[PDB]
Amino acid sequence: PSMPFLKRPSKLDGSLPGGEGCFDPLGFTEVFSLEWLREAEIKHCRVAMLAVLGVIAQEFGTFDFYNAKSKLQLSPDLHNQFVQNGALQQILLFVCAWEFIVGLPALIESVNGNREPGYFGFDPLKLGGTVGSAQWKRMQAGELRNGRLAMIAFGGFFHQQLLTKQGIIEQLAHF
Template sequence: MAALMQKSAVTRPTFASRAGRRAVVVRAAADRKLWAPGVVAPEYLKGELAGDYGWDPLGLGADPVALRWYQQAELVHARWAMLGAAGVLVQEVVKPDVYFYEAGLPQNLPEPFTNINMGGLLAAEFLMMHFVEVRRWQDIRNFGSVNDDPIFKGNKVSNPVMGYPGFDPMGLSKGNFKELQTKEIKNGRLAMIAFMGFVLQAQATGKGPLAALSAHLSDPAGNNILKNIGTCTVPSSVDVQGLSIPLTCLWPGHH
């Protein structure tokens, strides 16, 4: 009897500790921010990734390998979108006479780039981007395998988390990199939406974002999304150095 009482005394704290752990898990799940009230996040989205709010309606991230790829793909697209959206706005302020949708054409480039061979430029960009993407895929498959400089041997970057080099010379993170990562992906997601808005708006109105905003504010009833349905300013093709490139209008309308 004494042995049974001793055994019971030993097992009771174990049950209590398990219950305590369950309570902690439930409490953590309740405190987690999700994309909508009352939704249940997929079990593979545990809130550990920056910007993870349990959103994956198609279950694309159920495969751990695919999830790593999608996470890095979103991060890269977010960073390009932030650069692109800022570039469009800055270009329209600095050179408002150049329409951003046509700013990349040779005739709109500054000297001495007006005579640059666009075919060669695109080929060089393709090769460089291909090299970078292959290296990024290698890092996703084997994290840390591409930290060494491929040209200047011996140089190595700090890469504590995939996609983040740990670069913070001004100490903005104050030791909390997760918060900065979350802010970055939030701003990146907004930038991706904004850039697509810039493109569709340009196709529908033929104006840059600041010019379109000014037109809307001057006449909200006459310049809005409803008035632009069925119009598209994008030509069916564009000639670049003797090469005819077909174009597609993403905005529902006609040429």
């Protein structure tokens, strides 16, 4: 098939930046028109890369004056420390300023089909921010791969709780 897999040869996609191929074994692009899903893939992979760098950076010891970590999940020590602090509200609310205000119409631009649904502009880099064909697509696939690895990697950075009950660095300090 056009897939590098069992068989479903180019159900709808293939020209998108999956450089190792078009994966799609379950019928989502069959009936979801794929642009919504591409925005969901890219937005989840961006926020997952911020998630995994958040977990690592919080495990490398930074607090102005707060509670010590011992984990970075399981709400009433970490997550529901800051909600009752009245602290994570605004860092959600500016995301509301990002999503409802300048992300929801952009998603509308990612419905009518004039978006290429990454692309909030945003290249503050000289000598390497090629907007064109080669480096833009081969770097968009790199954002995509490191973002997907951030998605599963953040799954593993969450679910080391039952036989861990500890950090990830202290998971490395035991086997």
